[PDB]
Amino acid sequence: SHSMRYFYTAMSRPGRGEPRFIAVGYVDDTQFVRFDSDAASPRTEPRAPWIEQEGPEYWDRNTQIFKTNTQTYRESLRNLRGYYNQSEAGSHIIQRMYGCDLGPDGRLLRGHDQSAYDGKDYIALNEDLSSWTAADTAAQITQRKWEAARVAEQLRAYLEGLCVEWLRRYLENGKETLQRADPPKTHVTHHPVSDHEATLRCWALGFYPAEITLTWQRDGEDQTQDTELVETRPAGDRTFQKWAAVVVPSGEEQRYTCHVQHEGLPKPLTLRW
Amino acid sequence: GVSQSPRYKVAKRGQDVALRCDPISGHVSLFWYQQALGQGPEFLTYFQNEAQLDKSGLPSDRFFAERPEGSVSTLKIQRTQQEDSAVYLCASSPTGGQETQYFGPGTRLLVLEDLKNVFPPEVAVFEPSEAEISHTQKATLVCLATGFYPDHVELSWWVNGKEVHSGVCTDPQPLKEQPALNDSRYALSSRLRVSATFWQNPRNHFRCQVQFYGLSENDEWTQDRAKPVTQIVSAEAWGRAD
Amino acid sequence: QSLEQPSEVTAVEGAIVQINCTYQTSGFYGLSWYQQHDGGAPTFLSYNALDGLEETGRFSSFLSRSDSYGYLLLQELQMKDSASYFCAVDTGGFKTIFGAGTRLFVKANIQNPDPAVYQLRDSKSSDKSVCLFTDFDSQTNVSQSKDSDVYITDKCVLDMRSMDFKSNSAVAWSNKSDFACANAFNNSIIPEDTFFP
């Protein structure tokens, strides 16, 4: 039902200055915090209205954590390079994805933490939140350090407590935008592409959250082979958009039907034009 | 482990002081702490490699911590005051914060108005009682370190050239010769218990050593009595068959 | 953002002792314990992040996050266990809050007590004389002298590892010729004390 997730990106740039650290936080599909170390005096910035109501004790704390992580990830990028016996001239990336998931019950459903190196799975926290799954030999050197540091213990405690606790607070403060699901604005457009060939486009617009299911049915059956599905795209105003298209024979357009599925809708919708 | 220098340091008011810390090799995290008598270590500054991530715990801008190379760390205290007197402990963690900390023995800093009261100790050994040998077949050698200022001493017992720890008992804290005084000189006692036969052997040499931490060669001294410098005062005794 | 622990705790050699620690913070990450001898380096004992017991030989530390309570338990007490014990609370980041500390006093197990006051002499008697109170039981207490020129130290335990023998000792001295062993102690001493001229 609800989730709080943090996405980290550490990037080495030999000769182009000190490694760049980007931290970004989300409550479901709504971003609320940002941090870029590339700024003059780097600070945590709000990206949602319901987070601006937080006091400076919160803001100087986020800045402290992310400033510390910037230093930690400079050392981590340097160390992983040594593990993989890589050139000091190459540009490498460490990415972290951690967070907690909540069911409709409001209780912790699942805690997670995953780390990557150059777009490849590196070190992940197991479902028990006690052990590590190291992808290779180098990732086992990181694991042994993280075992002695008691990362899994203090991370499990955070994901079960503080993560869930703060997510609930963010969900209450933003109950009007976060807990209210915007349904999509639908319509189907006709675009002739030949003498007897035409394209039907089913539009799903201004919907929140991002999860949607758009399908074209020719008199009751699905057309996965014909259905040109477009990737869900952000409208740029905290809403999302997607479209489904089918090339049909002229006259037979009416036998084609679009089915849209979203949580903002009480029951699935059917369109045809 | 983590090393720290100096072990003790006496300083005059307004003088600049430098405290060195050598943490464990490969330890990314470094901490500086201040420890007051009857209290625990209080945070001063945090280092992750060369980067000083925080210094909120530092009392004044007179205090300056550095770690240019992310290994050795120095703490410079510009224009010292009596309130700066405390044990300055340095700690390190291998890979970051919220971990096991590895501490140094710390620098005991004492800031004073002047140094005219600094004094080296007078060391004296007291040969065991015949009554003790006749009653318990054991011999207790008592050492007396007296009239020293400040509280900066390291007493050790040496038998036939090597240091001993069995039967040795040094006082936990040295007492004040004049308890109703600010400028009170200190006294420290220690006992070494050996067998009757070990003391009865005149081939056995006993030496009570007291390492005193006072003034350096650079410290100003315009007094008639000798400069109370960092020195070793000792008293010895030889075995008695009697 | 603070924590509480008792000032002093006393136990006998071979016994077990408990040091309680209550913390009052808003974001607990860990509760650790440290041992510190007079003028020494605080050494790590155990760390508690999650609730439960952490065992490291003779040392064990408990934690309850719901009660914000934790304690340190030390088994088979030895004389080397006499030190200051500190509980430390981590609240995320790097800033560690330490308690005021608990001073533990390990009382030596004396098998055969032989309280007595012996007189010792220096190589060159031109300075002073010393009176030694030794082999007394761990229950005995030694206080300061009535005279201003008579100095007395506190009792300390020595261990003769060769003979498996431990003894309590208190030293007394003065520079006045009037001073002697019989008058040297103005405190509660055991009746079977030997004195010899």
Partner: peptide, 9 residues
């Protein structure tokens, strides 16, 4: 609030 433990890999 993010995770408050920064550990070197």
């Amino acid at each position: 609030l993010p995770f408050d433990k920064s550990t070197v890999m």
